[PDB]
Amino acid sequence: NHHVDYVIRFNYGDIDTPEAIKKFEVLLLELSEVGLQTEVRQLFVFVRAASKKKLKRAVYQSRVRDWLYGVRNTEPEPASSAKPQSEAERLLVIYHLITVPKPRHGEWKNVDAIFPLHDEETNRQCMREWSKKTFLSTEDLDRIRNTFGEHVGFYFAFLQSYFRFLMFPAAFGFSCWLLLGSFSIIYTVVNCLWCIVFIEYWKRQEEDLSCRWQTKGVSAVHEKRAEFKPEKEVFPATKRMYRQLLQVPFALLAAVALGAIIATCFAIEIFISEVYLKGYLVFIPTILVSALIPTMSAVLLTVATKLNDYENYETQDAYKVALTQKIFVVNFITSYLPIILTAFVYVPFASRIVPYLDVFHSINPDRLRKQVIYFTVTAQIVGFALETIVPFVKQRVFREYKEARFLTRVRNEAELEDYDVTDDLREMCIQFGYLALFSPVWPLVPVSFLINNWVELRSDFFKICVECKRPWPQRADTIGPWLDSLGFLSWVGSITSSALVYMFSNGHPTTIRCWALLLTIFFSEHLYLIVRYAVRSALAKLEPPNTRRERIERFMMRKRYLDTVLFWMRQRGWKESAEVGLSLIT
C-alpha cells in the first residue's frame, strides 16, 4: 500500500559513460509508456503506473487481447469501468507492460532482475488462520489466486488435492501393517488402483480450476529466437525433430554416468557389509555419494542447458518444459536406483557374485527395511531443514554483516532468492514415487507423507512469504510437464510393485522366472493398462460444472453477435390430398 509495483536494479560493472547511456535509454522507454519511474540510488528504481486513465486503458487493452485469442471468452467490460478485480492482476499487466518488445531482464542490460514486493500485513495474517483448520478452503485458495499469480495457485491446488486423497491409503496401510504382515496382495491392489484414480481426478480437476480462474494459456511471449525465416504477416519446425533427435543420447549418457556412480557407491557398502575407524569407514560410501552426484548432476544441468538452447525456441513456456524433462531423467535415476539395486540384484542373487570384490582396496534381510525408512521418512526431515531453516539463518546472519524505512526494507528484499514453483514441485513428484514404487515395503509410508504434506503445505507457503522474493504473477492452465510425467511414474509402479510382491512371497534361482516372475508382470501390468482405460474414459463423461458453464457462456456470447449485428406436381397442397388419401380403400 505504498504506491509501488516493481524494482529494477543495476550492475556497476562498466565505465561511467555508457552506464549513463544505458540507464536513460531504458528510462526513456518507460518514459514513453509507464511514467513516474522514481529512483533512489541503492542503483534501483521504483516503477508505478502513472495515470489511472492510462491504467484503465491498459487493463482493458490486456482484457481485449486476452479475449480475442479465445481465453477470456466473455464480453470484455469497456474501458470506462474496468476494475482490476484483483491485486496481482493489476500487477500482472505492468509486467507485460515492461517486459514486452515494441527491456530484457536477465540479459542484454545491466539489470540483474525485476521484482515486486510483499504485503507483510496480510502475509502475517494468512498463516495464522489456516494454521488452525484441518485443510483450507476455496475462499482461502482464491486469496492465493488474487495474489501470487495463478501458476502458484495450481501448486497449492495440486498439493491440497494430493493431501485430502492421502487420507485413503494412509488409513488403509494403517490396517495391513496392523492386520497382515507386509507384502499383502490386498495392499498392493489398493495401492495401484488408488494411483490411477488420483491422476484422472486431477486431469479432470485442472479443467475446472483453470476454467474457474479464466485461463487457457496459449500465448505467452517470444524471445531470443533469431527467426531464421523472417515474415511480418518463420522457421521449419521439422528441424526441431532433427534436434530433438539429438535429445535421445543425452538420457543414456546420464544413465551411463550416474547409474555407474551410484552402483559403484552401492558396491562398496556391501563390501564393508562383508569384510567389516571401521565404523568410520562405514560412512565413506554415504560420504562418496553425498559429494559426487550433487556435483555430477550439476554438470548434467549444464549439458541439458547447452542442449536446450540449440533451437530457435519461439515460446516462453516450453523452455520451462524442455529444461524440466531433461532434468527429470537425472532425478529419476538419482532417487530410485538406490532402492532398485537393493531390491532387484541384492536379495534375489548377487550372493552368487559376492566373491567378486576389490581385494586391492550371507544375505542381510533388513537392507530394504532400513533404506526405505531412510528415504521416505528421514530425508523429508532433513529436507525440511535444508529447504527452510538453512536459508533463514542465512537471511538473518548475513543481514548483520552488511521515511527511510523502505530502503531498509527493499535492500533486504534484494538479498533473497526468486521462487520457483517447479523446483519445489519436483520434490513432490519424486516423493509421489516412493508411494508408487515401494509402498509394499513397510506400508506405513502414506502416513509419512500425510503428516508431511500437512506441514509441507504450511511451510512452503511460509517459504514464499519471507524467505524468498515475491514471484511475479505468471499464468498457466496446467502444472506443466509434471502431469504427463506423473502417469509414466505410476505406470512403472505397476511393474515393480507387482514383481516385488511375488519375490517376497514368504521367503527368498530360488523362485521360478518362467512360471511366476514374468506372467505376474504381464498379467498385472496389462491389467493396470485397461483400468486406466476404464476410468479415464469414465470421468470424461461425468462433465464437471464449470466447463459446462464455460461452454454455455461461449454459446450465449455468440447469441449476441448474431443478434446485435442481425414439374407436374399439382395436388394444390392439402385439399386434393384428401381425395387421393381416400384411395386407401382398395
Question: Rule CB under 8 A: which residues touch a second copy?
Answer: 3, 12, 16, 19-20, 23-24, 27-28, 31, 35-41, 43, 46, 48, 64, 67-70, 78, 237-238, 240-241, 244, 403, 513-514, 518-519, 521-522, 538, 541-542, 554-555, 558-562, 564-571, 573-574, 577-578, 580-585
Please, what is the minimum distance in Å from the beta carbon of residue 530 to a second copy?
10
Q: How far apart are CA 81 and CA 302, in angstroms?
A: 49
| Cα atoms in the 13 Å half-sphere on the side-chain side of 306 | 7
> Is 456 a binder of Ca ion (CB under 5 A)?
yes
In angstroms, the Cα distances linking 368 to 116, 189, 320, 470, 500 are 48, 21, 36, 42, 11
CA 73 from chain centre, in angstroms, equals 26
Please, what is the minimum distance in Å from the beta carbon of residue 509 to a second copy?
11
What is the phi/psi pair of residue 17, to 5°? Answer: -75, -50
For residue 551 the three cell numbers come to 461452454
Query: Which C-beta is closer to a second copy: that of 5 or that of 460?
Result: 5
Query: Which C-beta is closer to Ca ion: that of 288 or that of 379?
Result: 379
Please, what is the minimum distance in Å from the beta carbon of residue 247 to a second copy?
11
Nearest to 329 by CA among 307, 299, 297: 297
Query: Which C-beta is closer to a second copy: that of 50 or that of 373?
Result: 50
Among 66, 200, 460, 550, binds Ca ion (CB under 5 A): 460
553 Cβ partners below 8 Å, 6+ apart? 73, 74
Answer for the pair 31, 139: CB distance below 8 angstroms, yes or no.
Answer: no
Among 383, 391, 487, 544, binds Ca ion (CB under 5 A): 383
Residue found under cell 562405514: 282
> CB under 5 to 8 A by kind: which of a second copy, Ca ion, none does 401 bind?
none
Choices 52-60, 395-403, 453-461, 546-554 (CB under 5 A): range interacting with Ca ion: 453-461
Query: Which C-beta is closer to a second copy: that of 16 or that of 366?
Result: 16
Query: Which C-beta is closer to Ca ion: that of 431 or that of 496?
Result: 431
Burial (0-12, 13-18, 19+ Cβ within 10 Å), 112: middle
> CB under 5 to 8 A by kind: which of Ca ion, a second copy, none does 138 bind?
none
> CB under 5 to 8 A by kind: which of Ca ion, a second copy, none does 456 bind?
Ca ion
Which amino acid, residue 473?
Answer: P
In angstroms, the Cα distances linking 321 to 187, 310, 327, 361, 373 are 35, 15, 10, 44, 32
How many residues interact with Ca ion (rule CB under 5 A)?
A: 4
What is the phi/psi pair of residue 227, to 5°? Answer: 50, 70
Query: Which C-beta is closer to a second copy: that of 302 or that of 583?
Result: 583
Please, what is the minimum distance in Å from the beta carbon of residue 239 to a second copy?
11
Tell me how far apart the 2 most distant CA atoms of the chain are, in Å: 117
5 is in an annotated binding site: no
> CB under 5 to 8 A by kind: which of a second copy, Ca ion, none does 554 bind?
a second copy
Please, what is the minimum distance in Å from the beta carbon of residue 10 to Ca ion?
33
83 Cβ partners below 8 Å, 6+ apart? 77
456 is in an annotated binding site: yes
Total count of residues recorded for the chain: 586
Show the CA angle centred on residue 505, arms to residues 503 and 509, nearest 5°. 40
Q: What is the CA radius of gyration of the chain?
A: 30
Query: Which C-beta is closer to a second copy: that of 282 or that of 414?
Result: 414
> CB under 5 to 8 A by kind: which of a second copy, Ca ion, none does 344 bind?
none
For residue 395 the three cell numbers come to 537471511
Please, what is the minimum distance in Å from the beta carbon of residue 142 to Ca ion?
22
Strand extents, DSSP E, 167-272: none
Please, what is the minimum distance in Å from the beta carbon of residue 459 to Ca ion?
6
| Binding letters toward Ca ion, positions 384-423, x by CB under 5 A | ---x------------------------------------
Buried b (16+ CB within 10 A) or exposed e, 358-387: eeeeeeeeebbeebbbebbbebbeeeeeeb
> Per DSSP, what are the bridge partners of residue 6?
47
> CB under 5 to 8 A by kind: which of a second copy, Ca ion, none does 383 bind?
Ca ion
> CB under 5 to 8 A by kind: which of Ca ion, a second copy, none does 574 bind?
a second copy
Choices 203-211, 460-468, 504-512, 544-552 (CB under 5 A): range interacting with Ca ion: 460-468
Annotated binding site for Ca(2+): 387, 424, 427, 456, 460
Binding site for Ca ion (CB under 5 A): 383, 387, 456, 460
